[PDB]
Amino acid sequence: DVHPNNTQLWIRYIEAELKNRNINHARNLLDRAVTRLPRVSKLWYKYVY
């Protein structure tokens, strides 16, 4: 809410969701991240990886 378009915060929150084996939460998070920032290739690359 304070930093909507920060790619680093999105990456760390998807990573923190993934390292606790919350797969569906993190996939929803990656959908939100590629919806908000469709022109950041880092988020798309992480999502396909």
Added chain:
Amino acid sequence: SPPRKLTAEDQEAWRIPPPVSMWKNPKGFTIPLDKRLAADGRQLQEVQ
């Protein structure tokens, strides 16, 4: 739009040097005297 392609030339062209203040040291740093006189333009004066 898709991001503009940045060369290393641009990344070095927009490098800002650190301010060598010859009035203020708010953190009490012992700056070398070499750096203290770099921004002083009196060394770039033609005595003609």
Added chain:
Amino acid sequence: AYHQRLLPAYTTLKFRQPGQGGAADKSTRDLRAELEAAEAAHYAKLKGAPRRWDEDVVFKNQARGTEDKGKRKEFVNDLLRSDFHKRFMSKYVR
């Protein structure tokens, strides 16, 4: 709700009465014609179209070329070099 503490003041708005212009619209071609007519009138007004005692003195004619100040007023966009600042500093620092 709101949090303001204005006392009432100037509680009626003034409107442009007849003769004050404003809420009366013309075509922009008419505005161009009026602008060019007024500009042409102002430019035409600018163009006008409708023993000798002083013999032993060492230095002579040293004041020639002094009255030539004021041929045209030159605004200089450097405050420390303008005529206003030089007059200020010559007046106040002696």
Added chain:
Amino acid sequence: NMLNLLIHRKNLTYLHLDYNFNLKPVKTLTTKERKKSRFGNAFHLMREI
């Protein structure tokens, strides 16, 4: 009674309002007590009226 109630609600009970509307400290005031007890022009104007 209104001035006395306003004084007592603000817990300034070291100020005494006598019946001729004089406000005097009953003791010696500290700096914090002097800063808390400093009334304004509305209270004092109403008191003098």
Added chain:
Amino acid sequence: LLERWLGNLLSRQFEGRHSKGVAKTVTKQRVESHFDLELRASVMADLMDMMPEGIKQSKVNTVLQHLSEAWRCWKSNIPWKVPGLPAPIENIILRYVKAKADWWISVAHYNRERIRRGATVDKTVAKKNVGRLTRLWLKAEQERQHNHMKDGPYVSSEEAVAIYTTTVHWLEARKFSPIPFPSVSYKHDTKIL
């Protein structure tokens, strides 16, 4: 008046103080501070609009420190030139330093005119104005000395020879004896001392 005042008093007594959130006006004691705020924001805004998309935009307050350094160099008549600084950033800094200089000189002129008129009884304002015109006069004096170094002696050689010759002929016509060096055997050294 008194009923509005007592209503405000009872409002602070029974629903509290709205201390935070209101816009304070820019009174005299705030003017310079307000100026600094606005100027910094303007400079900062220009920086965010000159950064190319992809540059590391964290250390950009470094430019605000460079702006402070450039203003300090302007006040001391020291030529400010940072080697390796990018040209658009240097242009932004020079542009806003000249705007601050224009404001500073205008305020100095206004305060001097108030002091001459007798319209000011503040002492710190007067001492500030004396300092500002001291700096302005020293900048003008440095420029005058540098101009005399560049443009040569303004007295022409013919003018100086004429002045010297007139002095020689006058002092010869007056039978003037040149003043000697103070001798060791001078009998008036003690009283002059």
Added chain:
RNA sequence: AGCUCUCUUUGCCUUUUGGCUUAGAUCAAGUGUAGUA
């Protein structure tokens, strides 16, 4: 060729000087001895 070990190199900024005004303004200091045993 790849994987690992140590070292070097490149990239690396990783915490890598919150403002303003009359450089905000000013600013020496006790003492310090011992003819004769």
Added chain:
RNA sequence: GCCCUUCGGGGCAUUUGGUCAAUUUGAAACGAUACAGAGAAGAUUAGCAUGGCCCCUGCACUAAGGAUGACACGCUACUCAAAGAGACGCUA
């Protein structure tokens, strides 16, 4: 109670009140006392701002004060690699 009456009957007037009086157990605030002691890289200090789940005094929620009112001084891996050798050894 009164009024009207063709003594059959009818009329006028119509629902108050967020209150137990009852102070330990439905919520006040200190001071004294002890203690600590006023910011800017030597010492001494005038200040003006900035941010808000910090306020106080004030009519000022478009003054001015409260030590420049206080507070801030912390903490610090993560958008994150590539090389060219040599090498206990791996391995083709």
Added chain:
RNA sequence: AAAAAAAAAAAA
């Protein structure tokens, strides 16, 4: 032809 508060005296 006759004008009379604050800065500023500091957080168990």
